Design a protein around this ligand. Structure first.
Ligand SMILES: OC[C@H]1O[C@H](O[C@H]2[C@H](O)[C@@H](O)[C@@H](O[C@H]3[C@H](O)[C@@H](O)[C@@H](O)O[C@@H]3CO)O[C@@H]2CO)[C@H](O)[C@@H](O)[C@@H]1O
Ligand code: CA
Ligand code: CA
Ligand code: CA
Length: 484
């Protein structure tokens, strides 16, 4: 991460061209170059790259992912004046509080809604149970009733939650992380209705985000389910669209998981005061938010001054009605593990490779497996922090013509350092200096116990993978792996 610059990461479905224009405004005032990028799967790339002292200065995602980042020491604690904090809604600050510490800037609140084509469907159904007979009638006319992204569990969740599915039980003050709420009759009813939609040929199991979007925007399907970010593309299509409350299931509202889009600062960033300045004085103003909101709409924004205007919009009213029927997501580190489990379960029930019952019964176990990988990935990053301090010691030792201590010493001699999960030492000879980090035999994931990571250290000082490494390749940063 280079000083005197700002790299920003934001997902490809958000108003990144609007944000790049707010960064141009910053650059003209300060002389600081801003770059907005939207790499694929950035929320999973960010941990790997920040572990090696790389990636963006600022990271945009929904708040559900930020407890995992914070827990691993990847984010800077944000500490704004109370005058600044009074400008945003208090409940949006709650979403970015982990462990007593504010860990991001809240930007906007987003919930899924039902989107419908007013020419195909002047009066959309109030219940999920009407949809099949509606699809049957529309098929006679060469149309379908409903298409949405079945590949991502965010979109199926509102239906699963409707009759009693939950993520983690809330046991006064704390979340009970071993009480997952997917293996129950209510969630089973929800997922069964969805699988029967596929089985009765009202939907296709491989429908993804872009297929559903294209079909709605070209008038092939009467309804979709999506968030505020999608409205911009429907505006420039031919469709006359409405935004409304999601349908009921078994007489109960659909319950979307509400995300608070949030902006965090990389712990390894040399440009923290500049990132703070950018977010506080440029982005989180009426001007800043209007520019992003013009590109792709944000939903209901955290800034109270600008939310005054946006709440007159009927579509924001519907978004907020849908948010009140649902729940704000947890930000605990186990959230990713939860979403990976639910993803696998939906895909397996929808394709027919398991029953609804077996698929949902396996969820808690699959989530635990996913969490174990996260723990192991997180502990393994200590290797790259200890290596970082060691490579300067290589650079100071070499003045005596050796990798090792001070003078021209033949073997490693107080060129070591201890960590929480393992110990690292300098090795090699001539100008071919290495760094080895060896994990402890216990007190650390059984995937890592007694493995080593060996690194070559070039003239310039980049760390590359030495073939002596035996720490599992899939637990290491992909960039490091790719160097060997
Ligand atoms: O399913 C695998 C996937 O799970 C996790 O992704 C979840 C996000 O963390 C969560 O915020 C939400 O993502 C949606 C955004 O909130 C919304 O703004 C917009 O971008 O749509 C997203 C849905 O595609 O839900 C997903 C689960 O669908 C995890 O973070 C990912 O790394 C993982 O790949
Ligand atoms: Ca018309
Ligand atoms: Ca994870
Ligand atoms: Ca899995």
């Amino acid at each position: 991460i280079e000083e005197g610059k700002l790299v920003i990461w934001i997902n490809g479905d958000k108003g990144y061209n609007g944000l790049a224009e707010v960064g141009k405004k910053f650059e003209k005032d300060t002389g600081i170059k801003v770059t907005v990028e939207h790499p694929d799967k950035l929320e999973e790339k960010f941990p790997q790259v920040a572990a090696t002292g790389d990636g963006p200065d600022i990271i945009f995602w929904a708040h559900d992912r930020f407890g995992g980042y914070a827990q691993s020491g990847l984010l800077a604690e944000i500490t704004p004046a109370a005058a600044f904090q009074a400008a945003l809604y208090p409940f949006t600050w709650d979403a970015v509080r982990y462990n007593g510490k504010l860990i991001a800037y809240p930007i906007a609140v987003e919930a899924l809604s039902l989107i419908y084509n007013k020419d195909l469907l002047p009066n959309p159904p109030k219940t999920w149970e009407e949809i099949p007979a509606l699809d049957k009638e529309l098929k006679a006319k060469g149309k379908s009733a409903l298409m949405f992204n079945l590949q991502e569990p965010y979109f199926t969740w509102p239906l699963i939650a409707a009759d009693g599915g939950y993520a983690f039980k809330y046991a006064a003050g704390k979340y009970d992380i071993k009480d997952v709420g997917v293996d129950n009759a209510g969630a089973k009813a929800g997922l069964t209705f969805l699988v029967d939609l596929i089985k009765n040929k009202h939907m296709n199991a491989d429908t993804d985000y872009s297929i559903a979007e294209a079909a709605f925007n070209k008038g092939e399907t009467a309804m979709t389910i999506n968030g505020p970010w999608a409205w911009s593309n429907i505006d420039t299509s031919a469709v006359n669209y409405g935004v409304t409350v999601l349908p009921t299931f078994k007489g109960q509202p659909s319950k979307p998981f509400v995300g608070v889009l949030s902006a965090g600062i990389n712990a390894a960033s040399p440009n923290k005061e500049l990132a703070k300045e950018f977010l506080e004085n440029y982005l989180l103003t009426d001007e800043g938010l209007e520019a992003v909101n013009k590109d792709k709409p944000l939903g209901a924004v955290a800034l109270k001054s600008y939310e005054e205007e946006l709440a007159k919009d009927p579509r924001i009213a519907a978004t907020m009605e849908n948010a009140q029927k649902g729940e704000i997501m947890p930000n605990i580190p186990q959230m990713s593990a939860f979403w990976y489990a639910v993803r696998t379960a939906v895909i397996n029930a929808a394709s027919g490779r398991q029953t609804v019952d077996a698929a949902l019964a396996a969820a808690q176990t699959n989530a635990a497996a996913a969490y174990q990988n996260y723990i192991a990935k997180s502990q393994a990053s200590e290797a790259f922090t200890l290596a970082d301090g060691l490579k300067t010691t290589i650079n100071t030792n070499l003045q005596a013509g050796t990798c090792f201590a001070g003078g021209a010493t033949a073997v490693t001699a107080a060129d070591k350092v201890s960590g929480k999960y393992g110990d690292a030492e300098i090795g090699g000879s001539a100008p071919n200096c290495t760094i080895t980090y060896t994990f402890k035999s216990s007190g650390v994931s059984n995937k890592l116990t007694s493995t080593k990571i060996v690194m070559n250290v070039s003239e310039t000082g980049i760390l590359t993978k030495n073939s002596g490494t035996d720490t599992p390749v899939e637990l290491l940063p992909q960039s490091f792996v790719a160097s060997g």
